[PDB]
Design an enzyme around this catalytic site. Structure first.
Site, PDB file in Angstrom:
ATOM      1  N   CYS A 129     -10.132  25.110  36.801  1.00  0.00           N
ATOM      2  CA  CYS A 129     -11.474  24.861  37.354  1.00  0.00           C
ATOM      3  C   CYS A 129     -12.344  23.964  36.472  1.00  0.00           C
ATOM      4  CB  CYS A 129     -12.219  26.176  37.643  1.00  0.00           C
ATOM      5  SG  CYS A 129     -13.903  25.930  38.245  1.00  0.00           S
ATOM      6  N   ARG A 173     -16.630  24.927  35.482  1.00  0.00           N
ATOM      7  CA  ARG A 173     -16.964  26.148  34.756  1.00  0.00           C
ATOM      8  C   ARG A 173     -18.277  26.106  33.966  1.00  0.00           C
ATOM      9  NH1 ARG A 173     -11.419  27.079  31.717  1.00  0.00           N
ATOM     10  NH2 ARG A 173     -10.938  24.945  32.443  1.00  0.00           N
ATOM     11  N   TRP A 221     -19.548  25.133  45.097  1.00  0.00           N
ATOM     12  CA  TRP A 221     -19.705  23.934  45.913  1.00  0.00           C
ATOM     13  C   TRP A 221     -18.624  22.880  45.645  1.00  0.00           C
ATOM     14  CZ3 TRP A 221     -23.759  25.694  42.762  1.00  0.00           C
ATOM     15  CH2 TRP A 221     -23.905  25.022  41.544  1.00  0.00           C
ATOM     16  N   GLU A 272     -12.339  16.406  46.157  1.00  0.00           N
ATOM     17  CA  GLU A 272     -11.584  17.462  46.825  1.00  0.00           C
ATOM     18  C   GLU A 272     -11.441  17.158  48.303  1.00  0.00           C
ATOM     19  OE1 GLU A 272     -11.746  21.632  45.543  1.00  0.00           O
ATOM     20  OE2 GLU A 272     -13.843  21.195  45.043  1.00  0.00           O
TER      21      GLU A 272
HETATM   22  C1  HEM Z   1     -19.710  25.843  41.600  1.00  0.00           C
HETATM   23  C2  HEM Z   1     -19.046  24.700  41.358  1.00  0.00           C
HETATM   24  C3  HEM Z   1     -17.503  24.595  41.302  1.00  0.00           C
HETATM   25  C4  HEM Z   1     -16.829  23.434  41.274  1.00  0.00           C
HETATM   26  C5  HEM Z   1     -17.469  22.035  41.324  1.00  0.00           C
HETATM   27  C6  HEM Z   1     -15.410  23.720  41.220  1.00  0.00           C
HETATM   28  C7  HEM Z   1     -14.385  22.796  41.189  1.00  0.00           C
HETATM   29  C8  HEM Z   1     -13.040  23.099  41.128  1.00  0.00           C
HETATM   30  C9  HEM Z   1     -11.913  22.186  41.258  1.00  0.00           C
HETATM   31  C10 HEM Z   1     -11.947  20.668  41.489  1.00  0.00           C
HETATM   32  C11 HEM Z   1     -10.794  22.879  41.133  1.00  0.00           C
HETATM   33  C12 HEM Z   1      -9.378  22.275  41.217  1.00  0.00           C
HETATM   34  C13 HEM Z   1      -8.585  22.992  42.309  1.00  0.00           C
HETATM   35  C14 HEM Z   1      -8.361  22.075  43.474  1.00  0.00           C
HETATM   36  O1  HEM Z   1      -8.960  20.974  43.487  1.00  0.00           O
HETATM   37  O2  HEM Z   1      -7.585  22.438  44.384  1.00  0.00           O
HETATM   38  C15 HEM Z   1     -11.155  24.265  40.925  1.00  0.00           C
HETATM   39  C16 HEM Z   1     -10.271  25.300  40.745  1.00  0.00           C
HETATM   40  C17 HEM Z   1     -10.540  26.633  40.599  1.00  0.00           C
HETATM   41  N1  HEM Z   1     -11.797  27.237  40.584  1.00  0.00           N
HETATM   42 FE1  HEM Z   1     -13.621  26.174  40.573  1.00  0.00          FE
HETATM   43  N2  HEM Z   1     -15.265  25.095  41.186  1.00  0.00           N
HETATM   44  C18 HEM Z   1     -16.528  25.677  41.257  1.00  0.00           C
HETATM   45  C19 HEM Z   1     -16.789  27.040  41.248  1.00  0.00           C
HETATM   46  C20 HEM Z   1     -15.899  28.086  41.082  1.00  0.00           C
HETATM   47  C21 HEM Z   1     -16.193  29.507  41.227  1.00  0.00           C
HETATM   48  C22 HEM Z   1     -17.599  30.057  41.607  1.00  0.00           C
HETATM   49  C23 HEM Z   1     -15.053  30.191  40.990  1.00  0.00           C
HETATM   50  C24 HEM Z   1     -14.799  31.721  41.000  1.00  0.00           C
HETATM   51  C25 HEM Z   1     -15.773  32.626  41.147  1.00  0.00           C
HETATM   52  C26 HEM Z   1     -14.019  29.226  40.683  1.00  0.00           C
HETATM   53  C27 HEM Z   1     -12.708  29.514  40.371  1.00  0.00           C
HETATM   54  C28 HEM Z   1     -11.665  28.612  40.425  1.00  0.00           C
HETATM   55  C29 HEM Z   1     -10.254  28.945  40.323  1.00  0.00           C
HETATM   56  C30 HEM Z   1      -9.609  30.330  40.132  1.00  0.00           C
HETATM   57  C31 HEM Z   1      -9.509  27.627  40.440  1.00  0.00           C
HETATM   58  C32 HEM Z   1      -7.976  27.419  40.407  1.00  0.00           C
HETATM   59  C33 HEM Z   1      -7.553  27.218  41.865  1.00  0.00           C
HETATM   60  C34 HEM Z   1      -6.072  27.396  42.083  1.00  0.00           C
HETATM   61  O3  HEM Z   1      -5.275  27.174  41.130  1.00  0.00           O
HETATM   62  O4  HEM Z   1      -5.694  27.759  43.230  1.00  0.00           O
HETATM   63  N3  HEM Z   1     -14.567  27.960  40.743  1.00  0.00           N
HETATM   64  N4  HEM Z   1     -12.530  24.364  40.916  1.00  0.00           N
HETATM   65  C1  LIG Z   2      -1.302  25.514  46.443  1.00  0.00           C
HETATM   66  C2  LIG Z   2      -2.337  25.951  45.426  1.00  0.00           C
HETATM   67  C3  LIG Z   2      -3.622  25.218  45.720  1.00  0.00           C
HETATM   68  C4  LIG Z   2      -3.611  24.119  46.570  1.00  0.00           C
HETATM   69  C5  LIG Z   2      -4.789  23.442  46.851  1.00  0.00           C
HETATM   70  C6  LIG Z   2      -4.786  22.245  47.772  1.00  0.00           C
HETATM   71  N1  LIG Z   2      -3.403  21.754  47.940  1.00  0.00           N
HETATM   72  C7  LIG Z   2      -3.391  20.501  48.721  1.00  0.00           C
HETATM   73  C8  LIG Z   2      -5.973  23.876  46.285  1.00  0.00           C
HETATM   74  C9  LIG Z   2      -5.988  24.972  45.430  1.00  0.00           C
HETATM   75  O1  LIG Z   2      -7.183  25.369  44.891  1.00  0.00           O
HETATM   76  C10 LIG Z   2      -8.294  25.093  45.727  1.00  0.00           C
HETATM   77  C11 LIG Z   2      -9.630  25.503  45.165  1.00  0.00           C
HETATM   78  C12 LIG Z   2      -9.810  26.705  44.488  1.00  0.00           C
HETATM   79  C13 LIG Z   2     -11.082  27.033  44.010  1.00  0.00           C
HETATM   80  C14 LIG Z   2     -12.162  26.161  44.203  1.00  0.00           C
HETATM   81  C15 LIG Z   2     -13.437  26.468  43.735  1.00  0.00           C
HETATM   82  C16 LIG Z   2     -14.478  25.575  43.954  1.00  0.00           C
HETATM   83  C17 LIG Z   2     -14.235  24.381  44.618  1.00  0.00           C
HETATM   84  N2  LIG Z   2     -15.238  23.489  44.835  1.00  0.00           N
HETATM   85  N3  LIG Z   2     -12.992  24.104  45.067  1.00  0.00           N
HETATM   86  C18 LIG Z   2     -11.967  24.961  44.876  1.00  0.00           C
HETATM   87  C19 LIG Z   2     -10.705  24.639  45.358  1.00  0.00           C
HETATM   88  C20 LIG Z   2      -4.809  25.648  45.153  1.00  0.00           C
HETATM   89 CL   LIG Z   3     -10.613  22.064  50.338  1.00  0.00          CL
END
Ligand code: HEM
Ligand SMILES: CCc1cc(CNC)cc(OCc2ccc3ccc(N)nc3c2)c1
Ligand SMILES: [Cl-]
Ligand code: HEM
Ligand SMILES: CCc1cc(CNC)cc(OCc2ccc3ccc(N)nc3c2)c1
Ligand SMILES: C[C@H](O)[C@H](O)[C@H]1CNc2nc(N)[nH]c(=O)c2N1
Ligand SMILES: C[C@H](O)[C@H](O)[C@H]1CNc2nc(N)[nH]c(=O)c2N1
Ligand SMILES: [Ca+2]
Ligand SMILES: [Cl-]
Ligand SMILES: [Gd]
Ligand SMILES: [Gd]
Ligand SMILES: [Zn+2]
Lengths: 402, 404
Positions: free
Chosen positions: B108, B111, B280, B285
């Site tokens: 993430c 953070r 948000w 994304e």
């Molecule tokens: C508020 C602004 C936030 C932004 C801009 C943001 C942005 C992102 C981005 C770009 C990713 C990469 C995952 C992807 O693109 O698929 C991500 C992953 C992740 N975020 Fe954040 N996020 C936010 C808030 C949060 C919150 C509030 C939580 C939990 C309470 C969180 C927990 C996670 C987790 C666990 C991942 C790993 C996703 C995965 O591996 O499936 N994030 N976030």
């Molecule tokens: C397969 C695991 C996976 C895939 C994908 C998309 N694959 C095309 C996204 C994944 O994470 C997606 C995710 C998780 C947490 C978020 C929190 C905030 C945010 N703005 N975006 C998030 C987006 C995980």
């Molecule tokens: Cl999405």
């Protein structure tokens, strides 16, 4: 228990059985990944050597033959007598190709088999070294139709010092310190620039001044060598639809020739074995010009583009970056100098991983280095999982001789 | 203590926090597997050690370690687990845990916001209809007329024997993916399967390429059940480009609240299979991954034609041109609609800021380089030139088997 690897764009799944042969250890443990870091007697030489000979003899389908056993017996008998051994020329050619083949961070590996190997192991001085180098440059450049080449200078050996090429690449531009504390030319080359000067180079004061060579014969100080101007093919940079661009006065050089890496074949070390292929447009467009710690022209291009540089959300950085890449591609095409864009490059790399899975049951690959630095997910490598590991023969980093 | 460098500035730090990482990752000295999406694969003496460790650092972060309530709270948990084999978390602990899990999530990039998280305690939930209400209040609060606010909703923890609470959708808002006599897809291909399930569970299918799916909510043991989302609760944004007037005519839209509803919250040894969190969107994304991936909306070539780009040679960088404009359209539309969104440049810079904060406070930060670096313009952002250490700390969000 071989790593399952997925391609997410397609759905395909393969297992990397080749990784399970990885002949060296990396920076990672199950505690912590370090993948993202840039920089991760006789009997042991025998076991590397024995391993390489086995490789060589596999590739010529004479595996486990007389000539194969004899060759092992030859090598261990010579490590007895001298504490080292000599590669036969075919073994060196195969070893140099495999080193490229094994290079995890190389996206140009589809080409690995088309490598021209110049054997300069008979090389004698810094002077003979210079000549071999000029000839490498001449052959590889080929008037803009670039060929992949490697020149192999004499191996690290007991009793003598190393040949070393002090320069990081055969062609690089000066970086001068300043009155503003800033740098003129390429900031990545300030150190070697300082060294050249204090070794008798009369510096210039441009941003694209090509550096002299600092060449080192065993047990000699380094010796300064000026490259004959007409041997260095350059490309003035212009934009196909932005005419003010040519007035930036930007240039890059044709030949990317990395000259500070060590080549390892079967426990033997060649501290001087410069090689060269051809540029991917992103090395020059994004990295060389747009890195802040390099030429850093991004804002300057953005302003000239009349982008709104006040706010990030206008994406002025992205828009300027794309034009700089277009300019580089266009200019190299106008000049008839070989160049590959990141989309073509990454697509042949996919073909590569596929050739490699059939051939060796896998392919060592460094994802963070293989994915290009713009348009990442726009290219197929971004969506592909990869196993990173070290196979020998190999190119390795080595510390700067100074 | 891994030495970590930044190549843009030259600075060096040591990740001492890495040393405290327990639950082993996928990599070994012989081969790196950082690039893999799902690392490898997916007598209660263990529950206690996880519990005592969580409680200690809880009290560490309020200075109250040594003497006072600290000792006291260690036995209550001991007692509870001795008595029942599980334990309940104090509401502050729950808040603390949810917050930390976000703080430890190496993938993430946002953070820097980890301290401002709203925890809705929904442990006193016993019904799917009830969940739906919780999920609906979350959506309402989180969305907040487009002024987004990070929120998570924590449903009851998993108990030894008897079922789980589970949201069968990967997110609270997902678009439909419809197959046909082509094998191709109208809508979102990522949600093809869950669209199959939605229909097979009674849902009346729809028009096409931006139909909000209904939820599939599952209370323990008793099978899942469909709940239609109130259209006034699902804020969306039609995509328009600021200067390319035809863009709107492409009829693209994307929703407002990214709300992940399939990840498993793990605090102090307790497993929460249902804990829908949201924040948000970072622009890329949507702009890059969602609309331009070959296996998602795959719109890139379509935009290119409209822009009259030379799609005949890759070296025209038509893909690169189209993709930027798609991204500009996303940011513009979200701004016009007054919905919170952040661009990749702003986000990464704040993550660098987060890194230096986290250096002084905890002696490092687990970061997944490949997920921190944006999907476009990577080397144009500061995180690209920053070396990163990736490791697992608890509390965490973990991926979990789907309920099939
Ligand atoms: C508020 C602004 C936030 C932004 C801009 C943001 C942005 C992102 C981005 C770009 C990713 C990469 C995952 C992807 O693109 O698929 C991500 C992953 C992740 N975020 Fe954040 N996020 C936010 C808030 C949060 C919150 C509030 C939580 C939990 C309470 C969180 C927990 C996670 C987790 C666990 C991942 C790993 C996703 C995965 O591996 O499936 N994030 N976030
Ligand atoms: C397969 C695991 C996976 C895939 C994908 C998309 N694959 C095309 C996204 C994944 O994470 C997606 C995710 C998780 C947490 C978020 C929190 C905030 C945010 N703005 N975006 C998030 C987006 C995980
Ligand atoms: Cl999405
Ligand atoms: C002919 C076309 C070639 C292309 C398009 C190409 C492309 C690339 C690129 C883009 C990189 C990353 C470098 C960076 O980002 O600075 C790289 C790394 C590398 N390449 Fe290639 N290359 C080519 C030829 C060769 C040849 C001929 C060799 C050796 C015989 C080679 C060996 C290597 C090695 C060892 C690395 C990693 C270097 C490092 O880690 O610093 N390449 N290649
Ligand atoms: C620090 C180690 C390093 C840095 C950098 C640039 N950093 C801004 C480049 C490095 O390798 C650079 C390289 C190596 C081999 C190549 C082969 C062909 C080619 N076209 N380019 C190459 C480029 C190593
Ligand atoms: C810190 C980070 O690992 C470093 O900047 C790397 C990332 N990936 C790269 N990839 C390539 N091809 N070349 C590079 O110089 C880098 N730099
Ligand atoms: C194979 C590769 O690791 C995979 O495509 C990853 C790369 N980085 C990513 N980064 C983010 N933020 N989201 C992703 O889905 C991915 N996919
Ligand atoms: Ca046309
Ligand atoms: Cl270069
Ligand atoms: Gd023009
Ligand atoms: Gd038109
Ligand atoms: Zn690793």
């Amino acid at each position: 228990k071989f790593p399952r690897v997925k391609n997410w764009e397609v759905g395909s799944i393969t297992y990397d059985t080749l990784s399970a042969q990885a002949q060296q250890d990396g920076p990672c443990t199950p505690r912590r990944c370090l993948g993202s870091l840039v920089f991760p007697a006789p009997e042991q030489l025998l076991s590397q050597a024995r391993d390489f000979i086995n490789q060589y003899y596999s590739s010529i389908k004479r595996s486990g033959s007389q000539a194969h056993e004899q060759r092992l017996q030859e090598v261990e008998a010579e490590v007895a007598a001298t504490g080292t051994y000599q590669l036969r020329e075919s073994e060196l050619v195969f070893g140099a190709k495999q080193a490229w083949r094994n290079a995890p961070r190389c996206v140009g590996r589809i080409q690995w088999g088309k490598l021209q190997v110049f054997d300069a192991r008979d090389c004698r001085s810094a002077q003979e070294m210079f000549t071999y180098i000029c000839n490498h440059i001449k052959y590889a450049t080929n008037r803009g139709n670039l060929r992949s080449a490697i020149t192999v200078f004499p191996q690290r050996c007991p009793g003598r010092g190393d040949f070393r090429i002090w320069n990081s690449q055969l062609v690089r531009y000066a970086g001068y310190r300043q009155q503003d504390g800033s740098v003129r030319g390429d900031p990545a080359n300030v150190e070697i620039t300082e060294l050249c000067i204090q070794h008798g180079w009369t510096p210039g004061n441009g941003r694209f001044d090509v550096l002299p060579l600092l060449l080192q014969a065993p047990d000699e100080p380094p010796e300064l060598f000026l490259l004959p101007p007409e041997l260095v093919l350059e490309v003035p940079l212009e934009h196909p639809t932005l005419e003010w661009f040519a007035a930036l006065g930007l240039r890059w050089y044709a030949l990317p020739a990395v000259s500070n890496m060590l080549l390892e074949i079967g426990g033997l070390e060649f501290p001087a074995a410069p090689f060269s292929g051809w540029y991917m447009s992103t090395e020059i467009g994004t990295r060389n010009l747009c890195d802040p710690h390099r030429y850093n022209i991004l804002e300057d291009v953005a302003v000239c583009m009349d982008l709104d540089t006040r706010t990030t959300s206008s994406l002025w950085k992205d828009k300027a970056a794309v034009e700089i890449n277009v300019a580089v591609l266009h200019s190299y095409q106008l000049a008839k100098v070989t160049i590959v864009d990141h989309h073509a490059a990454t697509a042949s790399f996919m073909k590569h991983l596929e050739n490699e899975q059939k051939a060796r049951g896998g392919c060592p690959a460094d994802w963070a280095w293989i994915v290009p630095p713009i348009s990442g997910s726009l290219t197929p490598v971004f969506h592909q999982e990869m196993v990173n590991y070290f196979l020998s023969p190999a190119f390795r980093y080595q510390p700067d001789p100074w």
